[model samples]
Target: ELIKENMPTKLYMEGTVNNHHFKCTSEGEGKPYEGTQTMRIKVVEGGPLPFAFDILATSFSRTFIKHPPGIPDFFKQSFPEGFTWERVTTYEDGGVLTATQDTSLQDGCLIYNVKVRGVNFPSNGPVMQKKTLGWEASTETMYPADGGLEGRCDMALKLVGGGHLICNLKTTYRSKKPATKLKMPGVYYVDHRLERIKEADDETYVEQHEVAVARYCDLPSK
Candidate 1:
C-alpha cells in the first residue's frame, strides 16, 4: 500500500497592520473542548521580520499525549519506516506559499527565524481571543481568552538517520494582567526540529518546546 503523507502547510503574512487569527478545536472519548487565540505576524516599518510556529498547540494534555516516549515506538512497530520527504524548493504569491528557513537548535533550546511568504491582511482581522491554548492547532474548537497572555518555550532534537533528526521543546504561557498567584496566561515561544529515522515505522519523529512570550516582531537597526 502506498503510504500517503502530507505535511501541514499554514498561511504566513508579514508587514505592519496585517494580522490574521485562527480557530481550533478537539473532541475525545469524553466531552469536547474548544478555544481561540490570536496568531500575529506584525512587520515593523523598517527591515524584515522573522516568525516561527510550535507544531503542537499550547496545552498540558496535548504535550503528554503526543510526546510520550512510547508513542513513536508504538507507531514504528505498527508501520514501515518511511522514506525521506526531501525539502522541495517552493515559493508563494498573494495568498499562501511553502517556505523553508534556517534556524538555530539547542540541546534544550531552539532559536530560529521563520520566513512567511505571500499572505492576505484585512482591517478587522480575528485575534486569538480564546482562553486555554488547546485546539489552536485546527479550527472547530474555540473559547474566549479568560486570562492575560504570558508563556515560554524551548526546543531540541534526537537523532533519526542519514544526518536527519526530530525536534523537541517545552513551553510555558502565563498571564501578567489579572495578577494571579500562578505564573501563567501569557504569550510564549515554541520551537522544534523533526528528523527522519531508520528502522522506524514512521520516517520522522517530533520534539516539542513549551514556550513563553511569543511575539511577531522585527529587529532593531544599529
Candidate 2:
C-alpha cells in the first residue's frame, strides 16, 4: 500500500572519492499505522561500495565493462573476472564488497514503488540510480528482507529529478536473507583467487598496497 511520499530520512556519503574506496550509509525511520511502510532502515557500508548490490544481476558481470584488468577474458568466456561474484555469496550471508570502490573500477534513496521491473544495480553506475533502482519512474515495494549478516532495509528510492534509486541497508530486524555460496555459470572475476573472502576489509587497500609493496621492494635511488 502507498504510505506517503517525501518521507524524511538520512543518507550519509561516507568514505571518500578514491578508487575502491567508498561508503554510503543510510539511516532512516518513519512512523505510521494501519497500512504504512516499515519504520527504519540502515546499511553501515563499512568498506567500499555505493550501495548493497546483487552479484547475480542480469547482464551477468556487467555490460560496457570498458576496463577490467583483463577485459579480454570476458570474450574468451573463462571463469572469474572483475570482482569475484562467487565470493559475494556471503553478501547474502556475510559482509562483502564494502562500499564505493573502483579498480580505476568500482564504484541512493528509497521510495518504494510497485508493479515495476526488478533492478540490476549497483548498476553501470557508482550509485543505484533510477534505471536499475526502481521501475519506469515509479518504484518497487519497500520491505524488510531476511538473511545476510543482519536485517536489511530494502526499498526503491524515488529521486527528486523524476527518477529513482535502490537501497539495501543492514539493520536490526530479520530484513534480508543471507547469500549462499554458489558458482554461477556466467560469473567470473578478472583475477579470480581461490581464497574465500574472509574479512570485510580484505580487499580494502589491495590495489594501492600492491603498488606500494612493489615500490618498496625496488628501493628508490638505491
Candidate 3:
C-alpha cells in the first residue's frame, strides 16, 4: 500500500560521483573527475506512487574539475530544468532481479522511463538538453523491514549540437526510523550517510550529516 496524506516520512541519503570521464570530440580532450553530495527527501503528502515531497541538498563537496581545453567556463555550466517519468512495468512479490521463481510478498518492483531536461551550457545562454534517464527500484512488502528498498539509476546528456556527460547511481534503504511531528504545514527531517565507488577507481568517498526541521509563525492580529 502507498502512504497517506499527512503521514510524515523521512529519508537520509549520501552518495559520491567519481571516475567521471569527460571527453569532448570537438575540443579533443578527456579528464577524470570526482565529487560528493549529501541529500534528504521528506515526504509531506505521501499519498501515491509519485508522492509530493521536499528534497534538499544539505551539503555538497567536490574536487575542482578543470575544464577541457577550448571550452569556455560558460560552455561547461550545467543546471537542471525539469524531470518527467512513466512507470513501464511492475511486479508484485515475484520476479526479483536476483530471484529465479515467483515468490511471496517479499518485495515489489517498479520500472520507469524517465526524462530529464537541463541547460548543458549556462554560459552559452539558454541552450537546453533533453536526457533520457533510466530508473528502477524494488521495495519490501512487509512493514518495518530492514534494508527493505533498493534502486538504481543512470543518466546521459547530449547537448543540443555537441558535447555529452553520463553517470550511474545505485542506492539501498538501510532502515526506517520513527516519524516526528512538526509545526509547519509541510516539513520533515532525516539523518543518514552515503558511500561511493566507480569503475577503474580504487578510492571510496563517504560522508555523514544531521537532520533537523525548522518553522516560523507570526501573530495574525497585532
Candidate 4:
C-alpha cells in the first residue's frame, strides 16, 4: 500500500474551510468558520504492504446543523458526531484509491465518491550526505446531486522530521452550472494553505527553500 510505504511515522493536520453560502468573518484577524478540525495519526507498526496505525479526529462547529439551501451538506454529515472513522484500514498494493461516505446520518442517504492519484520520488540532498524525497497527490471528489457539490484537491507532502510532515494543499469546488430554486450555483474560488512545521532532519525538497515562510509574512513584524 502507498500509505504503508510513504506515510510518515506520525502525522497531524488542522485546517478550516470557508464557503460563499455562509458568512465567514474574523474577529481581530481570526477566521470564523463553519468549524475547526484536527486529525492525528500514529503508526504502531510499519512494514511493506500492510501496516497498523492509530487515528483520532476532533471537530468543533458554530454553523447551521440542518441543511441550508445552496450550501454543501457534506460538511455537516461528516463532522456532527466526531466519531472514529474506521477500526482499521486495509491497504491494497496496486490500484486507484477510493472511498464512499454515506450521507444517511444527515439526509437522503447522501453519498460522496473520491479518487486519488499519488506519486513519490526518493533521492539527493540539497547539499551532500543527507537525502530527501517528495510526494504529490491529487484527488477529485463528487457528492450526490442532492448536494450538487464537486471538488478537486492537489497536495504536496514533505517530511520535516521523523515525526512530522508538512502539507501544502489547494482545493477548488463548484456546483452544477445552472441555478435551481432550492440551490443556486454560487461563486466558487480556490483555497490554499500550509499545514505543518518541524525540524529539518537533513532533507531538502523539489522546490527551492524560500527564505520566508509566506510572501505576506515577509513584511515588518514589529
Which has the higher TM-score value, candidate number 1 or candidate number 3?
1
**lDDT score, residue 201, model 4?**
20
The lowest-lDDT stretch of 10 consecutive residues in candidate 4 is 51-60
Please identify model 3 stretches exceeding 4 Å from their true place: 1-146, 177-222
RMSD of each: 20.0, 22.1, 21.1, 15.9
In lDDT terms, which candidate is top?
Answer: 2
Q: What is the lDDT of candidate 4?
A: 0.22
Steric clash count of candidate 2: 42
Give the per-residue lDDT of model 2 (tens digit) for 1-222.
Answer: 222232233333333221333333332323221111222222244453344222212101111112233222221121112121111112222222323211111111232211112233334443332122222211111122232112222334333455444444332211111133221122222111111112234222211000000001124683
What's the candidate order when arranged by decreasing lDDT?
2, 4, 1, 3
TM for every model, in the order presented, reads 0.22, 0.18, 0.19, 0.29
For candidate 2, report its TM-score: 0.18
Put the candidates in TM-score order, highest first.
Answer: 4, 1, 3, 2
lDDT of 1 by residue, 1-222 (tens): 211121111222222212332222221111001111122222222322121222222220111112122212111121122111101111111122222322222232212233332244122212111111111121111111343211222222111222211222211112222333322212222222222111111101112222221122236878
Distance from true position, residue 182, model 2, in Å? 34
Better of 2 and 4 by lDDT: 2
* Tens digits of lDDT, candidate 4, 112-167: 22222222211131111122233332232332334344443343333335322233
On lDDT, the stronger of 2 and 3 is: 2
The local distance difference test score of model 3 is 0.19
